[PDB]
Structure formats: structure tokens, C-alpha cells
Amino acid sequence: HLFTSESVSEGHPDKIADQISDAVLDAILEQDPKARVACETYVKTGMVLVGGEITTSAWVDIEEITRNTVREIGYVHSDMGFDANSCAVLSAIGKQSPDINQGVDRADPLEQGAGDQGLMFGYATNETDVLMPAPITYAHRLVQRQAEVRKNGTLPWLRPDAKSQVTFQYDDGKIVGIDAVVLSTQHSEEIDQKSLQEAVMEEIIKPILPAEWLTSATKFFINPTGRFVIGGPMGDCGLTGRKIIVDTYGGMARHGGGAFSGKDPSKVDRSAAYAARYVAKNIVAAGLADRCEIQVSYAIGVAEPTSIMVETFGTEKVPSEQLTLLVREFFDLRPYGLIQMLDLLHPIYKETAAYGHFGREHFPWEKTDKAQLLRDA
Amino acid sequence: HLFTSESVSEGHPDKIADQISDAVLDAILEQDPKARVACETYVKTGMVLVGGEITTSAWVDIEEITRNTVREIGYVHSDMGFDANSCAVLSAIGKQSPDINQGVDRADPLEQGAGDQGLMFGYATNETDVLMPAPITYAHRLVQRQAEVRKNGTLPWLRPDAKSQVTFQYDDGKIVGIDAVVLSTQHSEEIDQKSLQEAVMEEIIKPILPAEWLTSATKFFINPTGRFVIGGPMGDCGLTGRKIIVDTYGGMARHGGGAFSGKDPSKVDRSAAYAARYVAKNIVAAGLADRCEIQVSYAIGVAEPTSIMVETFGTEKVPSEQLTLLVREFFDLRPYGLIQMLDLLHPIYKETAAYGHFGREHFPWEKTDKAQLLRDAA
Amino acid sequence: HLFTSESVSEGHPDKIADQISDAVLDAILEQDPKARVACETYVKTGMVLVGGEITTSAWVDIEEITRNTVREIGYVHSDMGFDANSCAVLSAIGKQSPDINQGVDRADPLEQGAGDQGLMFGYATNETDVLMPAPITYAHRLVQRQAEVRKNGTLPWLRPDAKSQVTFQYDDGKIVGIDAVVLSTQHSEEIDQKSLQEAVMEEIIKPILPAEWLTSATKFFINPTGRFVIGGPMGDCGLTGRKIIVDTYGGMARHGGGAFSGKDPSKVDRSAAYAARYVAKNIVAAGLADRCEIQVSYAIGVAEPTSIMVETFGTEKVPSEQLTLLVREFFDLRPYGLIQMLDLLHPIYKETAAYGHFGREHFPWEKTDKAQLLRDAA
Amino acid sequence: HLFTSESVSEGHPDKIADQISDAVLDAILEQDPKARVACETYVKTGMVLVGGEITTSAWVDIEEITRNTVREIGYVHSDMGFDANSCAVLSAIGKQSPDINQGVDRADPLEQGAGDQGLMFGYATNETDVLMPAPITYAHRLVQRQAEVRKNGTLPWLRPDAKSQVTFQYDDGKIVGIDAVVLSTQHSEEIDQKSLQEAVMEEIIKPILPAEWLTSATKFFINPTGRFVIGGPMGDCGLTGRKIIVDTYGGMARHGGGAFSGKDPSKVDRSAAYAARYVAKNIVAAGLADRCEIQVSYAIGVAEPTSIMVETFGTEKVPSEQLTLLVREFFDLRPYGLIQMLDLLHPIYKETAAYGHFGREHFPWEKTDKAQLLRDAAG
Ligand SMILES: C[S@+](CC[C@H](N)C(=O)[O-])C[C@H]1O[C@@H](n2cnc3c(N)ncnc32)[C@H](O)[C@@H]1O
Ligand SMILES: C[S@+](CC[C@H](N)C(=O)[O-])C[C@H]1O[C@@H](n2cnc3c(N)ncnc32)[C@H](O)[C@@H]1O
Ligand SMILES: C[S@+](CC[C@H](N)C(=O)[O-])C[C@H]1O[C@@H](n2cnc3c(N)ncnc32)[C@H](O)[C@@H]1O
Ligand SMILES: C[S@+](CC[C@H](N)C(=O)[O-])C[C@H]1O[C@@H](n2cnc3c(N)ncnc32)[C@H](O)[C@@H]1O
Ligand SMILES: C[S@+](CC[C@H](N)C(=O)[O-])C[C@H]1O[C@@H](n2cnc3c(N)ncnc32)[C@H](O)[C@@H]1O
Ligand SMILES: C[S@+](CC[C@H](N)C(=O)[O-])C[C@H]1O[C@@H](n2cnc3c(N)ncnc32)[C@H](O)[C@@H]1O
Ligand SMILES: [K+]
Ligand SMILES: [K+]
Ligand SMILES: [K+]
Ligand SMILES: [K+]
Ligand SMILES: [Mg+2]
Ligand SMILES: [Mg+2]
Ligand SMILES: [Mg+2]
Ligand SMILES: [Mg+2]
Ligand SMILES: [Mg+2]
Ligand SMILES: [Mg+2]
Ligand SMILES: [Mg+2]
Ligand SMILES: [Mg+2]
């Protein structure tokens, strides 16, 4: 069978919004680790609207945070369709509803109730070194490489907006090759399409995709519209939380529907999904399964989860029901437990808002620190 | 194992946005079936912002469409925190990028290119009469029931914002029961929690959930914060395309990340996901599989898909690669082919923007009209 | 001849905007008296947009200030068309341009430059005890009376939005009577027009206007479209700085065009118009003229005014050249000096933003503490 | 004595707002001459918000009108701080309240009610050929000149945002000279202050201001903070109706407070101020006074003005009681009549939204076609 996963650069309008949302979250947490933040960002031709519900003792400069974020992304001139230095920054930030907060923050700190209801999924598969699905990891690297080539001036005619897509060929449940690649990138008007296609293939795609998976029958589509000068917020509206699949496992695993960026750890949409990646990775790391997918769910203002489910796809190396009640022993999945487990009350979330929340070494939910102590029990 | 799906009422802030987006799409398509529409809606305390990229010959009243939509949902008074008749309606609507239209609308009509790149999933499972996963269909019915009991005045203290969550117990791959239920609903200040919990238990949950699946160990969580007076856009920002899982299969199937509402059929994020539901359902209806999950993908401005994948979870009733072989013969999955297959150039999409896009008889992608022809060529 | 002036209530949309701008200003100055503030507010159905240029070390809660200000005004329910508790509050506040600031905050505070170029008028007349023109005085009193009988419950069907207008008859420079009165007020649907008109007459108009100026020839126009249920920002957009004649002299005197509200005192549009009122009032209180109009002008970044003019309409008691010299001697009109002269670096401005900036004698620019000095020096 | 007036260029943010509001009005009136339009515009860094109350059968492209208007003004690049092609255009346009409209559009068109209450002034003076005060005339000419030499490429480092101010010396009611001139203009970073100041002197100030009014005593203030690179909406919020003295008589005459731009002629704030200029100009052109100030006032939903006043500052050549009678005999100041008198139901307003509503004699309220009639009836 064929399988396909996509990713987007830091300049894609939805990722701009995600990044602004987590930039504001970060600034707040630097001052107020216990702040309640639900930051939703809307980006369109000429304007950033930052809104949502925040309850904090912190004082942050929404305008300067936003301009700085768009500046680092690279939109700094009207020729690119968007300029960090001259766009509108609007705030529509209110307070968190008192009807919600009475369910989260309560008497005993360890009794903290879930921020909301909802379902979250985690996933891990041994087919890569970082225990991630291959299609989404190489999609991320393709767009991450585009931004690095753009920023270090190797291809100065590049623009921030870009998307990648890769369609892998599988057999025996293992990678055979790559049947199709797509790399669409915004560009200045100076460069013709033929020069751009060759530069993308040589400088973007070949350094990232192992040539074994590439054949003469491997199909390539580079700016297949034939022109990508208009881009960023000018050609497409950007919204926080509209890339939740490229944020996670590229469609290789199911999703509960919860967005990540702009949300402080009290939101189980984020903190549970990180903890679900945490256990599913460790479970694989201990060789107890080849592939593992966890589903947890919560009720509003209720500490204990309402559902836990371990799925091994017929690859378990110990009975599945032993695997389930071992998750329950070595991981605390109540809201207060998620935050303690992963050391989450820190400004570490802007770095997550582009190129995937999962599969990066240093994230606390990526550490394989309980791998050994899984076997022993 | 236990599996959990959720859904939200038409009054949930994200669904308000989805509904406004598709309400605008509908008005446009009624005048201009060929319009290019990408309508993104942002709703917060006191305001609706309608934005996006539209290229159309149609003239529509964004303000009145929006107020009328919020009216029908039920926010018609400041006591509820939001009033269709006095909120701000802002428009930030631009034109579609010329660099994209040159890849969609090109030369031959049947050589039309995909609206974007992306991946889309479809799904069907025989475990319900409408071939949908059970958790998401009963989730949808719980909030759909909440809106109907609110609107016909049986529980007049109900307010439009509501959510449901059901935890099903599976084993043998079959439904054992329901281990947990959640029904959070916005309410007037008149009624206390005990009275509300009883009324929700009696008028909401019991008429909808088969009593067999309820035991006495079945947990019930009703307004578990203890108060749900503040609600709608006042308590929670609402955005178009932020309920893509409750829009589809409640997490039972994978998702490609594409939102549906506010998008005209030239966006493969919508029309392909509808066509993948179409083929995955008809495949099950022909008895060729018990459960079937389809993945297709496209490259922007390219007619033919870049990937097709039929996954039957080991429940196939014919060889797997003959099942992929037949999808490619009796279904045209190029952009123009999707639209012809399902007759999508019609104002039918507002009805989809709440209570699921899948599992409702009348949608063109729910017809079981190729079921027999798939068993023939099998 | 006939002369007409108008005023508007604290609930008129433009005055809502002025009051929010100056509420924000006051909140900042309480923490940072030397803040640079140019706060512009836009109010329309369902939303308040607070924008402008602010450089300050203060932190103020724009949302809470706005809601509290709109609450005090009385818009607290969707039936009124606007609700302080559920409207959107958006911010678009930037920083003051450093290109402007280097001209204002120079190294030497004594050389503080004018915050902009421009011209400003001050006026006084011994026609009333507070040395204001009579038409604007009584126009303010009518809308202040409307607000009082609304707020104290006398006429609870009144809504916050209202306007007044009075046409006076003059003969040989003296008021002889009132020729026409207009009073428009928003109201609930519960009251019919004829009953409203009688109540406005008895409770608003007759207690405020002197009876000896009202005759059988006086025309009274009360809600003369026949209906005023829709009002506030729903019926009419409100913007800061769009009531500058109501704010000053009601058309009796000239105006240089600069708005007041939302501006810190380094904006000479505000501080130099207060100073010009101060010198005009003190000239008339000193008995040196019956009527006095002062023009002053500035260049941005320059301390010394570009012009000063004293106009007394033939009423002067000492030569006009003497009066102009007395103004130079007794008043500092450089920005540093006038801010110190009037003690302007305090949170005193929200109070000015409805019912007129002049004629209320606890304002520092209304003190006549230089009148005896001027009478002596002349 | 000294008297001062100011003006602003088409690129000043308040004037950007006035021009967008009147461009919207014109686009609507081209399709629907009887539309009810109250279009209010707010411009700040990166965004234009077009709002207000409009009832019309026209459809106009608000975005395209806004972008085209800002392009014509000259903000077309982020280096300038504002870009017509990449700024946000938001709409918050509602409908006119039917409670207002039932008072305006009554069954009998002759009984058309005033769009609001309010007071309006008109003014004329034989100080200049167009019968306007000299200070606002020359202040307008300075910023018009700034825009001209920016636009024709003479001084290409000029940017659109600019302001002027002139202080005239009067002696016995005549201009004797100019005491001070202010000219502030946004500019690119490529030019230094002293070079800019000399270029502004030579190319903007000296070709416009009479040389006999400029002496060694005249003070010249050119970009007196020392830098004006940040400008336009980035430096200063723009709002419709925040230049109403620049729009009219530069402070020489009184004002009733109503803004002009974005309003259709049923708003007497605009149409009755145009009418008041028309009757004042015709009185002075008829030779019946040297300067003349008219006040008119209305009640909302009422056709007959609540007051009319004729002030001639002692310069009248016939009794002031007779002048007021001539005004009532020769001018119709009811809303129906004044809209007919000045033929106001046409897309003519965008042109008014910068460089002043008065003094430009192709406008219909600038015609002196009643002066000879007034001259006859007075004797
Ligand atoms: C703009 S498209 C979606 C279609 C759009 N909403 C419309 O109005 O039709 C979404 C993404 O595709 C990318 N994109 C935009 N223009 C493109 C072009 N000419 N070629 C390839 N990719 C493009 C951008 O990263 C953009 O965010
Ligand atoms: C708690 S959530 C998201 C968290 C929120 N953004 C915050 O500020 O923390 C809000 C959503 O859940 C529902 N909700 C809001 N308040 C609720 C309450 N007291 N009890 C149960 N559900 C509530 C509403 O449908 C609303 O859309
Ligand atoms: C909150 S900060 C002051 C913090 C700063 N570190 C200090 O104390 O000097 C004030 C700046 O942020 C901007 N600002 C935006 N919103 C503001 C708000 N509600 N209150 C105060 N300043 C605001 C203004 O441009 C203002 O100059
Ligand atoms: C609404 S009117 C201005 C014209 C209006 N914007 C339109 O669309 O025609 C301006 C002010 O007049 C007052 N007003 C509103 N409705 C009124 C009514 N029905 N009768 C009398 N005055 C009214 C309110 O104070 C309002 O702010
Ligand atoms: C009614 S018109 C469309 C004309 C239509 N044929 C009719 O007669 O009803 C559009 C209405 O929506 C509002 N509107 C919003 N945006 C508009 C726009 N760009 N152009 C004209 N009207 C607009 C106005 O209140 C206007 O009355
Ligand atoms: C920006 S200033 C007014 C006060 C300003 N809002 C503040 O924050 O202090 C008003 C007008 O003066 C002009 N202006 C802006 N910057 C200027 C500068 N550096 N020098 C001279 N004039 C300037 C522009 O026409 C601007 O619209
Ligand atoms: K208005
Ligand atoms: K006078
Ligand atoms: K300003
Ligand atoms: K005069
Ligand atoms: Mg998107
Ligand atoms: Mg969610
Ligand atoms: Mg949401
Ligand atoms: Mg998508
Ligand atoms: Mg107004
Ligand atoms: Mg000013
Ligand atoms: Mg201004
Ligand atoms: Mg007015």
C-alpha cells in the first residue's frame, strides 16, 4: 500500500498563528508558571488578531511578541505580502470563565480537574530511530530544510511559505521507497520555474530524502501550479490549531481533535497528548510492542481519566491486558500528574509550534527514561 | 478495551463558526455554483469575524446571514452571553490568490487540478445501521437531542452551548456496553444542579442510549464543574475547522487534518473526504469488508491523486489488492470527478456544519447506490 | 437674531468613545503621570475598538476599564442595543513614534516641544456666572437632566442615548427668550410617543429652562421621527473626537479643530485649549472685557507658541495691545509652563469627557486666581 | 494681530480616512443616488476599518475601493509604513436605523426630514478671489504643493503624510505679511534634515507663498522634531471627521461640529453646511457685505430649519433684518429643497475629502449664480 503525510514550514499561515499563540504562552509562563492561557490567533492579509482567554499575573507585550515572532519567521517586507513591522496587531483577550476555573483549580492541588472533556491519542512505531512514523518525520525535515536554506542565504529568493508532501510505498509493514514527493515553496519573482525546480531538488530534497527510497519512477511535483509568488497570510487565512495532524503523527495515528498551541498545561488537549506520546514511546522503547497507540479521555473538572486504551496492532510482546494495567501503575494520568511527570510549567512551547510536537530529543515527553523500568515489571 | 468519542451542540463556539462559514458558502452557491469560497470564521465575546478568500459573481449579505445563523442557534439575548441581534459582524473577505486559481480552473474542465495538497481519510464499519462507528453516532445524537429538547421548550432553561462524551466498552470487536457518559450543557440560573442532572438524565440521555448498554456501574458526569451558566463565545473562543474529529468519525478513523466548513467543493480537503466516505461505505455495503478505511492524497493543481490506499483491518472478503484495483475503476477521484460523482455544486453544506458530516441518509456521499455493482465486479 | 447650540448625553456613541478614551488615559496617568497617550476609540454594534499610540510604564486593564465605563453609562442589556458585559473589547494600541517624541521630550524639560502643530481657541463671556455662553450651558443641562432622571429611576424607560438643542433669541446682545427646543432620547418599547413627550416636557425640559424664556411661541421637538428605540452604537457609530463643539462652546466661539479626549497634556490640542480658556476667563473675570476669544498656535517640537491673539469684540476696557502684553506677562503658554500652570499631570480627565470641558469650576482651567492680578497690572 | 490656520495633505491619516469614506459614498451614489450612507473609517498601522450605517441597493467592493484610494494617495510599500496592496481591509457596515429613516424619508418627498439635529455654519469674505479666508487658502496650497512635487517626481523622497500651518499678520483687517510657516513632511531615510529643509523651502514654500509677505522676520519651521520618517497610520491613528476645521475655513469662522465625509446629502451636517457656504458666498458676491457668516440648525425628522442667522460683522450694505429676509426668499434650506438647489445626488464627494470643501469653484455650492438676483432684490 501507499501512505501519505504532509508538513508545512514555519511561514505557512496556520503555523504563523500556532507560533504566535505559543510565543504568547511562553512569555506568560516565564513570569507566571501557573497562568491559565487559551490563546487563539487569526492571521490574514495585513493583520494579526490575538484572542482567547487568559488569567495571569504576568504582563506581556502582545504587539512586540507578535512582531518579533513574524520577524523571526521572515515576513519583513510588503514584497513578500506581509511585514512584521507594519502589520496590524489586534488583541481580543478576555478572562477565563469562572464557571470553568472552579473545576480546574480546587482545594487539593493533586485533585486538579481536567481542563475540559475530550479524547487524546499517542503513538510510537519502531520504524525510525526516534520511534516516529517515517512519512511525517521526512515531511517535517523537508520543510525544516527549506527554512534553513532560506535563512542561511543559500537560496535567497525563497520566501517563508512552503509545504511538503511525501507518499511512501510500504510492504511487509516496512518501507520500500518513496513513490511521490511534493515540495511547494513561495518565491520572489526573480527566479524562473525551471531554475527553481532544479534548486529545490538539489538543495532541498536530495539532502533530506535517502536516495535508496528514490527511483527513476519516483514522482516529483514542484510548484505544480506553476507560480508561488503570492503567499503567507495574503493568499491564505491562518488560524491556531488548523494543523493538528502535521502537529502529531501525519495521519499514521488517530486524533482526538484537540489543538495544542496557545494552551497552558492545564488543558488536557495538550498535556495528555504529550503524556500519551510519552507512554507509547516508552512502551516501544522497552520492546513490549513494535507499534503502540494510546487513547485517553477526560471529563470536565474531573481528575481521573474516563478512558484508557492501549492498542498494539497485533505486535504486543506481552499480554495486552497486562500492558494496559501497567500503564495504570507507572504513569499518573490525572491532570496534576501529567504536569509533574513531564515538568511542563516552563516556557518551552514556542519551539513546539512548528515542525512537529513529537520526535525531538529534548522535549520532556520524548525522553526514554522509563524504558528499562518497563521490562522489569 | 474502552473507546471514547465526543460531539458538541450547534451552540458550541467552534460549531457556531463552522455553521456561519457554511451558511455563507450556501448563500453564495445558491447564486453562483462555480464560486471559489474559503470562509474562515472567528467568534468571541460580542463579535463574529468572517474572513477568507472568495471569488464569486454572487452578492450576499454577510451581516444578515450571520445574525440569522446565530439566531437559529438560539443566542438571542445578553443573558445567554451572546445576542444575534446586537453582536458585531466584521468582514475580512479577500479575493482568491491568482497563483492558485491558475492551477484549479485550467484549460479542460475535466483536467481541473486539486485545490491544494493534502491527505484525506474515509471510513465505514458495519457495527451500525448507517455504517458509522457507534461512539460518534451516539455522541452526535446526545447533543442533537439536547438542542431539540431546548428548542421545543421541554427544558426551557437550557442554553445552546453543550457537549457530549460516551465511553464504549468493546470486546470481540463488538459493543459490550457504555462505561461512561458525559453531558455538559449551558443553563439558565433558575435551576439548581440536582434538578438539572435529573432532567438531563431523564430527557436527554435515556431516550437516546439503548438501556442494555447502561449498567449500574456506568459512570455519569453531568456539568461536573458544578455550574455551566457562562457559555458560548463568552467563555470560549470559536474558530472554523476546530472540530474536524467530531465532524468525521470521533477518532475511530484517522484524519488528514483538513477542515470542511466554509470550503467550496473544489477544495479536496472536503470533496475528497466526502468521496472517501462514499467509497468506504459502498465497499462495506457490498459486504466486501466489515470495516474499511480509505486514504487518498493530492498535489496542488494536479488532477490525478498522488496516493490511494484501501485498508480493511484483516476483515476483507476478497483479496486486498483486487479491492484497491476496483476502487480505481468505478470511482473518478480527480477533482472534477469528485464533484460529478456526488453532485456537489448545490447549497447543501450548512446542514453538514453540526452533528457530523457522515451518517445522514440524504447526503449524496451517503447513498449506497454502487453497493451491488461492487459485488458484481468482485 | 437666533442662535442655536446642542449637547449630547453620556450615552451618545461619540461620548461613549470620548469617555472610554479618557478613562484609559486616567488609569494610565494614575500610575505614570508623564505617560504619552493618544487613545482613539471606535464603538459600533457589539464592539469597542480601543486604539492609538501609547508609551507608558503603566499597565492598565483596557477590557475592564471599557466595560466599567460602559456600565456606568448604563448600557447593560441587549434590549438597550448594547451591553457592557457582553460586547467585544478589541485593542489596537501601538507605541508613540520616536520621531515625534524626540521633539516633545527634549533633554531640557523647560524646552518641551508642543506635541503637534495646530491652533486652539479659548473663550469667555460674562453672559453667565461661570463665564460661559448661555446656549451651550443650557444644552448641557438638558442632557445632564435626562441622564439624572434615567439613573435615579424617575423615568426608568429612558435609555442612555440622548441629544438636546436650544435656539435662543437675542436682542441687543441679551437673551430675550428661547425660540425652539429639541430633545431626543432613546427609550424602551414600553412607552408610547405622546406619553414620552409629556414626561420629557415635565421632567427634563421645564425644570431646566427658565420659564420666562418659554412662551406660546416656543417650539418643542421631542423624538420628532416618532420613534427612538434603536440607539446607542447600534443606531450610530461612535468615535473619539467627534463632539469637539459640544465639548467647548457650542458654536458661540471659534475652534481650531483638535479633539480633547484620550490625549495626555503634552498634546497642546487639549492642554493649550484649556490654557486659552483659563486666560480668556481670567480676562473677563478681571473685568478687562465682556467677551474674550484667544487664539494660540504651535509647531510640533517647538516650545514657544507660533502665535497668540486676543479678540474682545469691541468690549475691551484697555487697549488690545495692552491685553496681549498682559497675556504674555501673566501666563506661560509654552508646553512646560502651561502644564505646570494648570497642574495637568493628574488623572482628572474622565470627568471632562461628557457635559462639556468648560464651565465646571473645580477644573483647574476654570479658576479665576489671576483676575485680581490682571486688574491690578492694567 | 496674528491669525493662524493649518492644513494637511491627502496622506495625513485623518484625510486618508475621509477619502476612503467619501470614495465608498461616491461608489454607492453612482449606482443608487438616494442611498443612505454614514460611512466611518478608522486607519491604524496595517489596517483599514470601514464601518457605519448604509442602506442602499448598490453593491460596491469595499476592499477594492479602499486599496485603490490608498494607492492613489501613495502608500504602496512597507518602507513608507503603510501598503495599499497588503494592508487589511475590514468591514463593520450595518444598516440605517428604521427609527431614523421614518423621520427622513416621509411619504411626501417635499417634507423630507433633516437627517439629524444640529447646527451648521457657512462663511464668505472678499479677502480672496474665491471669497475664502486667506490663511486656510494658503495652508491648503502648501500641502497641495507637497503632494504635487512628491507625485511628479521632483522630490521623490517625500512621503504622503504632511501638514502645513501659516501665521498671518493683520493690520486694520488687511494682510500685511506672514509671521511664521510650519511645513512638516514625512520622508525617506535617504535624506538628511538640512537638505530636506532647503528643498522644502525652495520647492514647496517659496513657490506658494507671496514673496512680499515673507521677510527676514518670518520664522520657518520645517520638520522641527528633526526627523519625520515614521508617518502615516503607523505614526498616528486616522479617523473620519477629525479634520473639520481644515475642511472648512481654517478657524476663521465658527463651526457647528458636524463632519462631512462619508455622509450622503440627507445628513444636514454636510448638505446644510454646503448650502450655508452657498448663501454666504452669494451674499458677499452680490456686494451686500464684505464678510458674512450664516448659522442654520435643524431638528431630526423635521423639514423646516429650527433657526437661521445672518452675521455680517458690521460690513453689511443693507439692514441685517433685510438680509435675513433675502435669505428666506432666495434659498430653500429645507432638506428636500437644498438637495435640489445644489444638485447633490451625484458621486461628487471624493474630490472634496482633501484640500478643503470650499474655495474650489466647480463645486455646486461655490457657484455665485444668485448674486445678481440678491443685488436686485436689495434695491
Ligand atoms: C492557499 S492554499 C488553500 C486554497 C485557498 N484557501 C483558496 O482560496 O483557494 C493553502 C496553502 O497552500 C500554499 N500555497 C499558496 N499558494 C500556493 C501556490 N501558488 N502554489 C503552491 N502552494 C501554494 C500555501 O502554503 C497556503 O497556505
Ligand atoms: C473548558 S472549554 C476550553 C477551555 C477554555 N478555553 C478556557 O478558558 O480554559 C470551553 C468549552 O467547553 C464548554 N464549557 C464551557 N464552560 C463549561 C462549563 N462550566 N462546564 C462544562 N462545559 C463548559 C463549552 O462548550 C466551551 O465551548
Ligand atoms: C504594559 S507596558 C509597561 C511595561 C514596561 N516593561 C514598563 O514598565 O516600562 C506599557 C506599554 O505597552 C503598550 N500597551 C499595550 N496595551 C497596553 C495596556 N492595556 N496598558 C498599558 N500599556 C499597553 C503600550 O504601547 C505601553 O507603552
Ligand atoms: C443616528 S444619528 C446620525 C445619522 C445616522 N448615523 C444614520 O445612519 O443616518 C446620530 C445621533 O442621533 C441620535 N439618534 C439616533 N436615533 C435617533 C432617533 N430615532 N431619533 C432622534 N435621534 C436619534 C443618536 O444620539 C445618534 O447617535
Ligand atoms: C442591500 S445591498 C445589496 C443590494 C440589493 N440588490 C438590494 O437592493 O437589497 C447591501 C446591503 O448590505 C450593507 N453592505 C455591506 N457591505 C456593503 C457593500 N460593499 N456595498 C453595499 N452595501 C453593503 C449595506 O447595509 C447594504 O444596504
Ligand atoms: C502623529 S501626530 C499627533 C500626536 C501623536 N498621535 C502622538 O502619538 O503623540 C499628528 C500628525 O502630525 C504628523 N506627524 C507625524 N510625525 C511627525 C513628525 N515626526 N514630525 C512632524 N509631524 C509629524 C502627521 O501628519 C500626524 O498624522
Ligand atoms: K455617526
Ligand atoms: K461673540
Ligand atoms: K491622533
Ligand atoms: K471674521
Ligand atoms: Mg489552513
Ligand atoms: Mg479541542
Ligand atoms: Mg475549540
Ligand atoms: Mg487543511
Ligand atoms: Mg457623530
Ligand atoms: Mg490635532
Ligand atoms: Mg487627528
Ligand atoms: Mg453630527
PDB file of C-alpha atoms in Angstrom, chain B residues 137-221:
ATOM      1  CA  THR B 137     -23.152   8.486  16.232  1.00  0.00           C
ATOM      2  CA  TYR B 138     -24.457   8.257  19.798  1.00  0.00           C
ATOM      3  CA  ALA B 139     -22.325  11.248  20.779  1.00  0.00           C
ATOM      4  CA  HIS B 140     -23.980  13.220  17.962  1.00  0.00           C
ATOM      5  CA  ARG B 141     -27.465  12.082  18.990  1.00  0.00           C
ATOM      6  CA  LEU B 142     -26.917  13.179  22.601  1.00  0.00           C
ATOM      7  CA  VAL B 143     -26.180  16.797  21.665  1.00  0.00           C
ATOM      8  CA  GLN B 144     -28.714  16.745  18.819  1.00  0.00           C
ATOM      9  CA  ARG B 145     -31.277  15.624  21.403  1.00  0.00           C
ATOM     10  CA  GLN B 146     -30.143  18.415  23.745  1.00  0.00           C
ATOM     11  CA  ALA B 147     -30.832  21.021  21.062  1.00  0.00           C
ATOM     12  CA  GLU B 148     -34.260  19.597  20.256  1.00  0.00           C
ATOM     13  CA  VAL B 149     -35.391  19.475  23.896  1.00  0.00           C
ATOM     14  CA  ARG B 150     -34.053  23.027  24.289  1.00  0.00           C
ATOM     15  CA  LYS B 151     -35.841  24.287  21.175  1.00  0.00           C
ATOM     16  CA  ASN B 152     -39.258  22.675  21.624  1.00  0.00           C
ATOM     17  CA  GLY B 153     -39.352  24.107  25.153  1.00  0.00           C
ATOM     18  CA  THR B 154     -39.425  20.834  27.088  1.00  0.00           C
ATOM     19  CA  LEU B 155     -36.438  22.126  29.101  1.00  0.00           C
ATOM     20  CA  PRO B 156     -36.678  25.909  28.587  1.00  0.00           C
ATOM     21  CA  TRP B 157     -33.811  26.646  30.994  1.00  0.00           C
ATOM     22  CA  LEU B 158     -31.406  25.023  28.521  1.00  0.00           C
ATOM     23  CA  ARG B 159     -28.938  27.285  26.712  1.00  0.00           C
ATOM     24  CA  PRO B 160     -27.357  26.487  23.333  1.00  0.00           C
ATOM     25  CA  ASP B 161     -23.811  25.510  24.414  1.00  0.00           C
ATOM     26  CA  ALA B 162     -23.452  21.776  25.100  1.00  0.00           C
ATOM     27  CA  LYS B 163     -21.071  18.817  24.756  1.00  0.00           C
ATOM     28  CA  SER B 164     -21.380  15.033  24.999  1.00  0.00           C
ATOM     29  CA  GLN B 165     -18.888  12.235  25.569  1.00  0.00           C
ATOM     30  CA  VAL B 166     -19.541   8.480  25.588  1.00  0.00           C
ATOM     31  CA  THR B 167     -17.062   5.754  26.575  1.00  0.00           C
ATOM     32  CA  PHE B 168     -17.946   2.426  24.959  1.00  0.00           C
ATOM     33  CA  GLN B 169     -16.761  -0.960  26.200  1.00  0.00           C
ATOM     34  CA  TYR B 170     -15.611  -3.177  23.326  1.00  0.00           C
ATOM     35  CA  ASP B 171     -14.543  -6.825  23.256  1.00  0.00           C
ATOM     36  CA  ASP B 172     -14.675  -9.430  20.477  1.00  0.00           C
ATOM     37  CA  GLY B 173     -14.652  -6.250  18.385  1.00  0.00           C
ATOM     38  CA  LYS B 174     -18.304  -5.808  19.395  1.00  0.00           C
ATOM     39  CA  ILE B 175     -20.108  -3.402  21.715  1.00  0.00           C
ATOM     40  CA  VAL B 176     -20.363  -4.673  25.293  1.00  0.00           C
ATOM     41  CA  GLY B 177     -21.902  -1.576  26.840  1.00  0.00           C
ATOM     42  CA  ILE B 178     -21.238   2.032  27.803  1.00  0.00           C
ATOM     43  CA  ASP B 179     -18.767   2.538  30.644  1.00  0.00           C
ATOM     44  CA  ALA B 180     -19.006   6.330  30.959  1.00  0.00           C
ATOM     45  CA  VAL B 181     -21.228   9.174  29.742  1.00  0.00           C
ATOM     46  CA  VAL B 182     -20.706  12.948  29.918  1.00  0.00           C
ATOM     47  CA  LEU B 183     -23.354  15.590  29.158  1.00  0.00           C
ATOM     48  CA  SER B 184     -22.333  19.190  29.881  1.00  0.00           C
ATOM     49  CA  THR B 185     -24.961  21.788  28.978  1.00  0.00           C
ATOM     50  CA  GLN B 186     -25.313  25.527  29.418  1.00  0.00           C
ATOM     51  CA  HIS B 187     -28.293  26.507  31.534  1.00  0.00           C
ATOM     52  CA  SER B 188     -30.281  29.373  32.975  1.00  0.00           C
ATOM     53  CA  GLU B 189     -29.507  30.495  36.513  1.00  0.00           C
ATOM     54  CA  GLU B 190     -33.031  29.487  37.598  1.00  0.00           C
ATOM     55  CA  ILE B 191     -32.311  25.781  38.001  1.00  0.00           C
ATOM     56  CA  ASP B 192     -30.062  24.056  40.539  1.00  0.00           C
ATOM     57  CA  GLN B 193     -27.617  21.268  39.757  1.00  0.00           C
ATOM     58  CA  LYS B 194     -29.649  18.409  41.251  1.00  0.00           C
ATOM     59  CA  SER B 195     -32.798  19.319  39.305  1.00  0.00           C
ATOM     60  CA  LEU B 196     -30.738  19.742  36.118  1.00  0.00           C
ATOM     61  CA  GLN B 197     -28.880  16.434  36.481  1.00  0.00           C
ATOM     62  CA  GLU B 198     -32.205  14.625  36.881  1.00  0.00           C
ATOM     63  CA  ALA B 199     -33.771  16.381  33.885  1.00  0.00           C
ATOM     64  CA  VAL B 200     -30.718  15.678  31.708  1.00  0.00           C
ATOM     65  CA  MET B 201     -30.688  12.041  32.816  1.00  0.00           C
ATOM     66  CA  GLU B 202     -34.402  11.707  32.060  1.00  0.00           C
ATOM     67  CA  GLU B 203     -34.960  13.847  28.954  1.00  0.00           C
ATOM     68  CA  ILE B 204     -31.509  13.796  27.311  1.00  0.00           C
ATOM     69  CA  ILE B 205     -29.578  10.587  27.874  1.00  0.00           C
ATOM     70  CA  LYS B 206     -32.184   7.861  28.392  1.00  0.00           C
ATOM     71  CA  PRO B 207     -34.301   8.479  25.236  1.00  0.00           C
ATOM     72  CA  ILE B 208     -31.113   8.184  23.144  1.00  0.00           C
ATOM     73  CA  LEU B 209     -28.846   5.488  24.624  1.00  0.00           C
ATOM     74  CA  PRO B 210     -30.051   1.854  24.477  1.00  0.00           C
ATOM     75  CA  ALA B 211     -30.660   0.851  28.086  1.00  0.00           C
ATOM     76  CA  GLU B 212     -28.902  -2.506  27.600  1.00  0.00           C
ATOM     77  CA  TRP B 213     -25.516  -0.781  27.307  1.00  0.00           C
ATOM     78  CA  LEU B 214     -26.174   1.091  30.565  1.00  0.00           C
ATOM     79  CA  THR B 215     -25.345  -0.886  33.689  1.00  0.00           C
ATOM     80  CA  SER B 216     -25.372   0.316  37.297  1.00  0.00           C
ATOM     81  CA  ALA B 217     -21.573   0.701  37.192  1.00  0.00           C
ATOM     82  CA  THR B 218     -21.949   3.058  34.198  1.00  0.00           C
ATOM     83  CA  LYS B 219     -20.497   6.396  35.311  1.00  0.00           C
ATOM     84  CA  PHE B 220     -22.391   9.616  34.537  1.00  0.00           C
ATOM     85  CA  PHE B 221     -20.820  13.095  34.666  1.00  0.00           C
TER      86      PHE B 221
END
